[PDB]
Structure formats: structure tokens, C-alpha cells
Amino acid sequence: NIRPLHDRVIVKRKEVETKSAGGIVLTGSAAAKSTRGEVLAVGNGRILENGEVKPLDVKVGDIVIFNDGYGVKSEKIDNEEVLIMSESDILAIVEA
Amino acid sequence: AAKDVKFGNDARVKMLRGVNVLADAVKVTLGPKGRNVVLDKSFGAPTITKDGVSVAREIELEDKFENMGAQMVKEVASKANDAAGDGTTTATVLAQAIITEGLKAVAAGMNPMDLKRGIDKAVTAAVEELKALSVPCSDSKAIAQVGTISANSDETVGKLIAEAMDKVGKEGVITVEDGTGLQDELDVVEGMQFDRGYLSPYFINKPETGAVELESPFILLADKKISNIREMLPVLEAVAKAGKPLLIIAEDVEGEALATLVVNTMRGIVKVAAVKAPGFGDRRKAMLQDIATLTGGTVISEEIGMELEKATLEDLGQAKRVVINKDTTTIIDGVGEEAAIQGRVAQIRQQIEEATSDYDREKLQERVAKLAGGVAVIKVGAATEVEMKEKKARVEDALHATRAAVEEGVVAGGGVALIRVASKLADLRGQNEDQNVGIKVALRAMEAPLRQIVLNCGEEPSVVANTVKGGDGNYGYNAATEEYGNMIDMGILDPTKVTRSALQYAASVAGLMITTECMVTDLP
Amino acid sequence: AAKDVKFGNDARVKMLRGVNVLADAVKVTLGPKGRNVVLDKSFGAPTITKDGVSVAREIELEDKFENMGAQMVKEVASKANDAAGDGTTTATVLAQAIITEGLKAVAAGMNPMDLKRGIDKAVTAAVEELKALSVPCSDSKAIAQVGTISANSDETVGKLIAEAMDKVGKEGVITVEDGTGLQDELDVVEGMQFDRGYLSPYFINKPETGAVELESPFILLADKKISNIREMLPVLEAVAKAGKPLLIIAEDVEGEALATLVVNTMRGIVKVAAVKAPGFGDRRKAMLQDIATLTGGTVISEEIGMELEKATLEDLGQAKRVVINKDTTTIIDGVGEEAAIQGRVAQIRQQIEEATSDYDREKLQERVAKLAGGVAVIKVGAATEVEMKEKKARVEDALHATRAAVEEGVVAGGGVALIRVASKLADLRGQNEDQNVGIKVALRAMEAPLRQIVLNCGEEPSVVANTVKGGDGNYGYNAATEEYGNMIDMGILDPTKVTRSALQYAASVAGLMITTECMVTDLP
């Protein structure tokens, strides 16, 4: 099991959309990596200048949008690819 | 530059002198008693050859008008070699006789256009009579006799070519190359035998032979080149779960992926081996798909869409045996559907029919022989280089004659077929008297191969020609024993394609040459 | 360009005149009393030679048809030099005699194709009779006599070559090079003696000789080139724990790693010495693996998977003595498994058999001689450059003759082997009279080497030929003493391979040349 630290989140990326809106199957770079993924593990929270830990607004099991870049890292947990990022790199939570 | 212009009989005489020079160079080789011709080569030793196309190619004359005649009559041997590969000497003998007899009627005041029309009509009827007279040649002894006769009565060459055609079947491809020994060697390969070796020397399962042996292995076909072990790592893990060996046909396996797979090979988890994909662009993909069809697998490519990561065991090909070595690789009994194999055979045959280039068509035929049937390589054995070239030319002519024999059939050799055809065409008539005379000179010139064979034997051409014309059927003149008999029984067979092609090309060029009146060349 | 075309007897006479020019240039050197030929070289001094292949190569005639004849008969000496290295003069003597006697029968109206068939049949039977007549040559005295006779009766060359083959054994490789002194020198090296020196001058353990001596040293084989000391630092520490000297065979040792190891060498912790790996790519790995097999070690490479960091003492090779000098490096008594060594010899011998190029095959044979047996270098000693070239050619011919003697055996020299063969083939018959006459001219031309030897001796060829034919067995004509006797007892032996090859190549080219009727060359 993996749980993150401070203001960082462990997220499994959602499966890439193989088929477009109108039944057109996209492959390769057309099947670009999804920016959405379910939250696997939430850290304790951001440490401010006062040393207090503020819990993150993200919750375990919620689909969220993440921005890939230098902030995001790749990891393998139980032979499965996951991404590692901070709550700033998390854009928004997908509901309904 | 400035031009010399000759008209009428002067130009005809000069052109005929050039034709006579080339044809006299060519026709000293006709028949079994025909002698060799030495051609001086500016680079290397001179070439001793008995085939008329080479000695026709090498002829070029100082007189420009005689050089015209030589080049125009050389076109006959060139076309006969391009189409049938044999009978170039017979084609030049026929072409010379039509020109000499045609110019005799041209000098007789007859219209050369009508003479050419008569020659064309007579030779069309002659082709029809040759087709009617032909007998199909499918049995092995007839093929052996055709190969023997076409190779200057060399029974070893004929029997070797007959055995090669028997081994590789009708769809097989047979080629002739030089050998290292003094004797003729036949090398027959079955299944896919593409000429690429292992990428690393460490794959060798059998060190005493340098050949990797894989018993019932999996086959992966990657249309792309790979340098990372990541992509087929699921496939490698699935193969290790299966435990069977795996052979990769890829554009390039190099560096990291290659090193890790050879390491896994000597670790014993997977008995894996990777080799380069054959051919080049626009050709590699097609016969990679042919390998996939043979092995019942599918090629991995970006265009077809699935990647090596989603490649599974079902995607990979299957064969019963795989042999890797330094230069080539053999796949024995690829586990693929028979109906798919025949569909691929039909598709490549349609590609052959649509192919208008000899190189592409011969590559397609080689691919057909690779996936279905076999491939034979005849190594010409000779003590010296010049004997190597001479024997190689003779074996090539014998191979072309056997191919023409299975393609179109056989007739009585020694020019007897043309004699019988001319005898059958005795009542053929044209629209006018000049056309009838052109028909007659065509019929007379069909006796030229037999007459020149007898002349090469040293006997009298007229007596033997009349004796053969007196006989009926395939009765003719054995030029080796100088006897008479049924030319089929004595094994003197000629391919119907060879004789018909020689007659047609000789007739076409010779008619065009007797139609001329003026010739314009450069000044000396 | 434009061509001159000659037919029949005119072309045959011109071609025979060219053959006579080349063969008369060549055959003045045959036998022990044969003289030398001076060949003009546009670059350097003229070459005085007694070998017929150089004279044959340097002959080219102004008359283009005679030049055809010269080139065609030069092919005989070229092929005889390529195959056996000796008997080029004998091959040209045989080829000229077949052509002259063959053209005599051709002028006699006999069929040249049947004459060539008869010559081929007679020479096939002659090869069989030479094989039956041959005796294997394994003893040292017979080898010395063969080397002496092949070197114009030079007993010093023959005895030196006999000693060289005795030293390096049957698997050894012997080569001839120029020497600095006036006398012949033999240089035999045992074990691996690849030609790379120490990478830095400071490794020298013995300053009075400039050679590093390592007693029972460890050997590390690095396929990759190293520039950092970190990788073999565990290996260096393990060696320092062992305390034995260490020798590196690497692609390149340079920079910080090289400086660190030489510093540690003069500090006395490790007695290390690094040298370059021999050869270049695709051959460096094979001979590195040969070094590993000899020393019982394993080559460190990225492809094989293990790294220098994981390399241990067991991975490193072991030998008893190591000598490093400026140009070469000698390994004496490499501690390796004998069975693995012989498996390596078998593998490289299979590679030799599969090799179709002289360069690759000779490199493989040199590798075999390095790993097993020894390598001999014969330094030709002569006071002048021209004598150096002449003596070097004679020693090369003697070496090729000794190699052919161990390969195929020996027969009576001086052309008596061919005389006995022709006497044995007296009852051989062809399919017709022309073939019988071709057989007879082949048999007569087998007397040509003896007759030309006698002609060079100044005596009468016919009397001596009849006297030798009257005798039986190896009775023949000593051409140096002008006497008669048993040629084996008199020490005049010829390699069976040399005589058989000369006869075969002469027969093939000569038959192909007598079959000709027309010759087409460029205009003058």
C-alpha cells in the first residue's frame, strides 16, 4: 500500500478513450493520455508557515483532473501504473 | 552531325552485308556440332560462349550501314533471349534467311510492303500450326531431354534440371549460380528461407553447427524496429508462461532490448532469438505478411494499429521448426491455415500478372516459391572461370528451355518443327503475287535452322533438308549421330515457345528490314 | 567500339600464336635447368622470376586476337596459382600442348566439341589414376624433398620448411616474409601472439629488454573500452587480495583508468598491464573468446550481460606466463579446459569450411594456429631486393607444394607421374573417333611437362620421353644430373594436388579454346 505525504495525492489515471464521440475509434496519439483519473490515496495535508497541517479538499475514490508535467511522477503499484502529484497539480474533481 | 544517305540496292547491300557478318558470327554455334565463339572483353578474360545472344550483342561493325544491319538483326537475338531465353541462334538464322530471300524478291522488283505482309501472314499461320503441332511437356523424362538438348546434349545438366523441377514442383523457382567445386550441385530449400542471420552470435543453441534450433517455437512479427524491452515484455512474459521458444522477425532489434533478450536466453527462462526483417520498404511488409500467413500469425505494426504491448500469444505465429544461422534462416512447417496460404498464393499470382517489370515479377515469384513449394539453386561446377561462364550459360539456356517446355509444350527439335510447319503451309496464299512470294520466302527460311545445323555438322544441307521434307511426322535428322529417325524417340525436343518466339521475332524484324529503301547514318 | 571478326582457321592460327607467345615465355622456366624471366615494372626495378604465373600475368600482345589467346591461356596459370600455388608453368605447358594438338585434330576435320569431350573424359580418368598412383606424404624427409624440388632444388629452403612444419605441427600456419639478413630465418611462436603492444611505456618489468614478464597472471578480457577505474575496481581489489599480476585485454584503456592502473603498478600493490584487443569489429569478439577459452576465462561485455563491477576472480582468465613487448603479446600455457579448446578448434574449422573467401578463411586458420599449435614466419634472406623477391617467390612455391603434399600426397616428379598416367590410360575410349582422338591428344600432352623439362635441359625430348615410357613405376629422368632412376629414391617428388590441378585447369581451358571457331575483338 502507498499513502502520500503533505499536500500530495496518488491517482490512478483513467483509461484512454479508445472511441470518440460519434463511434470513431481513435488510436495512437489521437488516443492521447487522459488527464482524468480516480484518486487512490490522499495525504495528511498541506503544511503552512505555522507548521499546521491543513487537510486536502480531495477525497479517496473521486475522479479528478490532473495536469501532467514536472510535478507528476510515474510509479508502479501492484503491477499497475499510477501517477503522483500535489494538490496544486490536481485541477478539479469530477462529480456526476 | 552530318549524315551519309544511301538509297535502294546500295543501302540494301550494305545492310545485308552487316546482317551477314552478325549472322555468320552467330550461326557457327547452332546445333550440337556448333562451335564456340570468343568475345574479347575489355575488362577480364575473353568469354568463350556457344549462345547466339552474347555473340550477337558483341558484334559492332566499322561500316556504319553494315553496323545498322548488325544492330537491327541483333535485335532479333536480344528479343528472343528476353522472351524465351533460348533459340537466339535459331532466331538469327531465321532472320538472316528471311532477309536474304526477302531482298532477293525485293531485287526482283516485288513490293517490299507486300512481301512483309506475306511474311507476317505466313508466320501467323506458322504460329498456329506450331501450336497445333505442339505436345504438352509435363513428364520428367521429356523435361530431362529438353534440358539435355538445350545444353549442347549434356545429359547431366538435363537430368539435374529435371530433378530440380521435380523437387520444387511447378510453383518452385530455380536459379543458376557459380559453384566452388568442379561438379554441378543442386541445393533445394523448403519453406521460408529468407537470407538474414541472427543479430547476435550468442543465440546459438547448437555450438557444433553454429545454428540455433527451435522446436515448435512462437513467432513474433514486428514491422517496426525495437530498442526497448518494454513493448513485448507482456508477450515475453506470456511466452515464458507457455515455455516455448520464440523467434522475432523485426526491422531491427538492437541495443538494450537485444541485450536483455539474449541475457534471458542464456538464463533459460525463454529460448528467444531475434533476426532482421527481410527486403526493404514496400516489399518487406508484403512477405512479412506472407510469413504471418504461413505461421498463422499477425504482423505487429503501427499502421495496422495494435502495439506490441497488447500483442498476445494468439497474435504470434506458429511453426514446428526454426533454424537460425549466420546468413539465412529456415522456417519448417509454419502452423497456418491452408486456405489462407492458397489465397495469398492467388493474390501474389495476380500481382505477377499485373507486374510489368521483370525484377518485381521475379521477386513475387520468389516469394511464391518461398511460401509454397521450394527454391532450387544450381551451382555450376567448373575447373576454371571461363568454363564456369560457359557452363552457366548452357545451364541457364537449359533452364529457360525447360520452363518454356512446361509453359507451352514441345515439338521435334533440330528445325524439324519448322520444316513440318512449312510443309503444312504449302497452300497458303496472300492477296497478291508479292504476298505469295513473301509467304514462300518465309516457308523457305523456316528450313534455315535445319540447313544451318547440317552445315555445322559438315554434311550437305540440301540433301538432308529434302530427306526430312520427304519424311512425315517428327521424322528428322539426328545431328549428333548424323542419322535419321523420330526426333521425339531420340529425345531431340524443342520448346514450342522457343521456336515460336524465334520465328516471330525473326519474321518481324526481317520484314521491317526488307521493307527499307533508304538508310541515313553518320559520316565516318 | 567497332569489332574485327575472324572465323575458322585464321582465328585459330592467331589465337594459337598468342598462346605460343605466352607459353614460350612461361616454359623457359620449367624444371631445374629452366631459366628466369625479366618482367618490366613501371614502378620499381624489373622483376626476375622463375614462376610461370608472373610471366603469364605480364604477357599482353599488340595483336588483339593473339592477345585473346594469351589471356585465355593465362587463365590456366592464374587458376593453378590460385588453387595449388605451384605448377603454373606445368599447367601452361600442358595447356599449350593440348591446344596445339587439339587444333591439329580440329584442322583435321574432327569435331571440336567431341575433342573437348574426349579431353575431359581422359583428364577425369587421369585424375582418378593420379589419385590411385599417389602416396601420402607425412614423413619429414619427403616434405623436405618436396620443398627442395619446388624451390629449384634448393635444399636449404626444403629443410627449413620441413623444420617449420615439424615445429608448428599440422594445424600450424606458416607464412613467408622479407628478412633483413642475407640468410633464411625461421621464427616460430607458440600460443597466442597477437600484435598489440603495451598501452603505456611504464609497464616494463624488465627494463633491460623492454618486456613485461608476468608469472602466473590473472587476465581480464574487456570487450568494451574503459576510461574509468570504477568498473574493474572490485576486480582490482580482488586481484590485490590475491596478489597475482593482472593483464587487461581491452578495446581501449585510456585516461584516468590507465593512469590509475599504471600508478598502482609502480606502487607495487598490483602488477597490472593493459593492452589493446586485437583486430576490429566482428573478429575482435571471436579472438577475444579464443583468448577466454585458452585462459579459462570469460569476456566481459554488455551483450553477454555481466559487467566489470560484477566481474570476479573466477570470471578472469588464468595463464602461466605473459610477455608484453612493443609490437606483440605472448601468452604461455593459458589455464583452460582442453575439451573446450578442441571444441573451439572444431568450431573454427567448421567456420573455415563454411568460409568462401580467402581472407576470412586465412584469418580463421591463423586464429586456429594461434590457439592451438604455433605460427611460423620464414624470413627470406637475400643481399638485394630482386634476389629477395625471387627467393621469396621460390619459398612461397615450396610452401604451397609442401601444403599440397600433406593435403593430397606425392607422386614422381619431372612429369613422370603424367607419363605413367597416360601409359595407364592407353585403352581408354570415347563415344566416337573424335572423342578417341581427343583422348589421345590429352595423353600425348601429358608428356609435355617431361618433354619441356628435357628441352630446358638441352637434351632430346623424344628420346627421354620414350626411355621413361619404356620404364615402369616411378622410374624417370633426373633433370639436374641428366640421369635416370627411381625418382622417389632420388628425392624428386611432386604434390599430387599440384599436378592434378595443373592438368585439370589446362584441360578445361584448352578444350574450351580448341572448341572455338569465331573470335570477335576490337579493331586496332
Ligand SMILES: Nc1ncnc2c1ncn2[C@@H]1O[C@H](COP(=O)(O)OP(=O)(O)OP(=O)(O)O)[C@@H](O)[C@H]1O
Ligand atoms: N543432337 C541433336 N540432333 C539434332 N538437332 C539438335 C541436336 N541437339 C540440338 N539440336 C537442335 O539444335 C537447335 C539449336 O541448338 P542450340 O541450342 O545450339 O541453339 P539455339 O537454341 O538457337 O541457341 P541459343 O542458346 O543462342 O539461343 C535446336 O533446334 C535443337 O533442336
Ligand SMILES: Nc1ncnc2c1ncn2[C@@H]1O[C@H](COP(=O)(O)OP(=O)(O)OP(=O)(O)O)[C@@H](O)[C@H]1O
Ligand atoms: N632435379 C629434378 N629432376 C627432375 N625433375 C625435376 C627436378 N627439379 C624439378 N623437377 C620437376 O620440374 C617440374 C617443374 O618445376 P618448376 O618448379 O620449375 O615448375 P612449376 O612448378 O610448374 O612452376 P611454377 O612455380 O611457376 O608453378 C616439376 O614437375 C618437378 O618435378
Ligand SMILES: [K+]
Ligand atoms: K547456339
Ligand SMILES: [K+]
Ligand atoms: K617454373
Ligand SMILES: [Mg+2]
Ligand atoms: Mg540455344
Ligand SMILES: [Mg+2]
Ligand atoms: Mg614451381
